Amino acid sequence: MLKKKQLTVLDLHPGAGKTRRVLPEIVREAIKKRLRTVILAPTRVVAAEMEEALRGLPVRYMTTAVNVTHSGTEIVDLMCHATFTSRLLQPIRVPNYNLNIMDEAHFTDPSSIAARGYISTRVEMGEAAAIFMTATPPGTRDAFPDSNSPIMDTEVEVPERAWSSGFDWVTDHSGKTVWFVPSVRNGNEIAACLTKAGKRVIQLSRKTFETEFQKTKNQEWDFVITTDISEMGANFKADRVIDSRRCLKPVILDGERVILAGPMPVTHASAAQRRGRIGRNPNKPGDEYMYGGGCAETDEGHAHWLEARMLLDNIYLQDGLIASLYRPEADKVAAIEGEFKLRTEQRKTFVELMKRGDLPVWLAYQVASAGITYTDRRWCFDGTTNNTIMEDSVPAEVWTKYGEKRVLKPRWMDARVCSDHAALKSFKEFAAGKR
Ligand SMILES: OCc1ccc(-n2cnc3ccccc32)cc1
Missing domain, CATH: 3.40.50.300 (P-loop containing nucleotide triphosphate hydrolases)
Incomplete structure (x- = not known):
């Protein structure tokens, strides 16, 4: 090698x-x-x-x-x-x-x-x-790879909302379940329903993962409710995976906004990694994989591959050459190598909007490429009315760094800045000039 x-x-x-x-x-x-x-x-x-x-x-x-x-x-x-x-x-x-x-x-x-x-x-x-x-290289079409011990695979309707009846198999289980949900908000509703039924539930997502993952070791639990982040080598002493087989897909519409489309089917690689949380102990056969939908290649046209091109266009390789995407995943985006290459000062802005700003790559790029400086937050307020961000069914409001209360109406709308309460809190802090 x-x-x-x-x-x-x-x-x-x-x-x-x-x-x-x-x-x-x-x-x-x-x-x-x-x-x-x-x-x-x-x-x-x-x-x-x-x-x-x-x-x-x-x-x-x-x-x-x-x-x-x-x-x-x-x-x-x-x-x-x-x-x-x-x-x-x-x-x-x-x-x-x-x-x-x-x-x-x-x-x-x-x-x-x-x-x-x-x-x-x-x-x-x-x-x-x-x-x-990786067990699941790009374009793998096998959602059911080999395991250390036999897995019981069952196609079954999986709840994505609170339920009162018709899913007794979910709560009748006496072991530990890892349950893959398509979003934080969806996991919150399932977690609340399980909590009300007397279960001990830990929730994992990207922002909470280091802190919260430790709870899976330090406390007794019945369910881990997780987003796709637990596809990346997260190990659990569990005997069942419940897999919605659904995810959210960031989609750039008309080059001008990002929406969180779906939920929609996971890739085969994601489904294989979700399932691969169990069947890991050769001394414990008959771990269960309950899956609630099919797979599809939902990575095609997914914003992450365009965002990856924005990052690679801004990395020095040699003279003016630009790194290509890894060949097996290079068709997931229609991009021109170099189209997102920024001049030195706009590149610095781009980097700071991601690193300190904690903005999604796409949104950092829009701001930097517009010639806006890192601390200039006027763009958070001067967008179209249809870009108004909502909080509890009312427009979200912040005090600007000038001390003026304003409606949050970003010039460029990326749904990831308000996908859950924590995201919107962070974006409000950003719009206010607090970082
Ligand atoms: O670029 C940000 C960033 C990330 C990690 C670290 N870092 C933490 N412990 C270290 C030990 C050796 C070298 C770098 C180290 C520094 C800077």
Whole structure:
């Protein structure tokens, strides 16, 4: 695998030991061959699990998820997918890694797709080697891969709302269930219904995942209600997955706004990862996978692949060359390489709107490309009436940094800034000039 110009897809089935068995063998070989190596973890939770798998090996943990004293002599770096792409975008030196290892390489967040684009382009140029570790590479059509123990697969109607009757199988279960929902708001309603029926429920989503995932270890629980973030190497001692088989799809309409379309079917890769949360213990056969819909290739025309192009157009590779998307996922977007390349000062603005602003990539791009500076929030208030953001069925209002109460009416509307109470709170703080 470690030979230059090679990209290896390590596609062992979920739970086959890619992270805890194969990765340390790769890292030992890389250190023997003096290969400057990066390991990319999808989440801080996975970064911390990797530290335990790699304990004893000289690895620099570029994450405060790991409390360690480095020797200063490590040639293997470990960081999150998003940290890698973030450092590439910023005026910070990123070494030209001889070996690029991406764990949970199916992750479809924009920064992960961009990282795979950059890495696969370096390999195609003859500059580097890469290993992409995932049971579900792009375009996989198999939702039911192999497992460590037999799984009971059942197609069944799954609730997406509070229910009073007709789903006794949900609550009659005496084990632990991981339940994949299409959104935070949908999970909130299911979680409230289970709580009212006497169940102990933990909710996971992107913003809460590091903090809340620890509860799955520290407290007894009956249900984990999760969004798709638990597709990225989240491990549970569970005996059942309930899978809506539904997700939200960010869609750019008419180049001018982002909507959260659906819910609609998950990809086969997502469904396989959701199912792959169970059947992991060869001593516990008959874990259950209950699934409530079919799969579809809903990654086609998904905003994340366009956002990945906006990130890659703004990463230096060599002169004016621009990294391509990883070939198997390159058709998911109709984009022109370089169309989103910003001049130096607009690029800095773009980066700060994502990093400090915490805005979605698409929205950061609209603001930066308009020649707006990071602290200029006038655009949060001067949009069309149809861009009015609602809070409890009334227009949302903030006090501007000038001390004026104004209706939130962004010039560019991206549904992800108000998809749940926490998102809208963060966007209100941004519009007010509070970060
Ligand atoms: O680019 C942002 C960012 C992310 C991670 C870190 N970081 C945390 N612990 C570290 C140890 C070694 C090198 C970098 C480290 C710094 C900066």
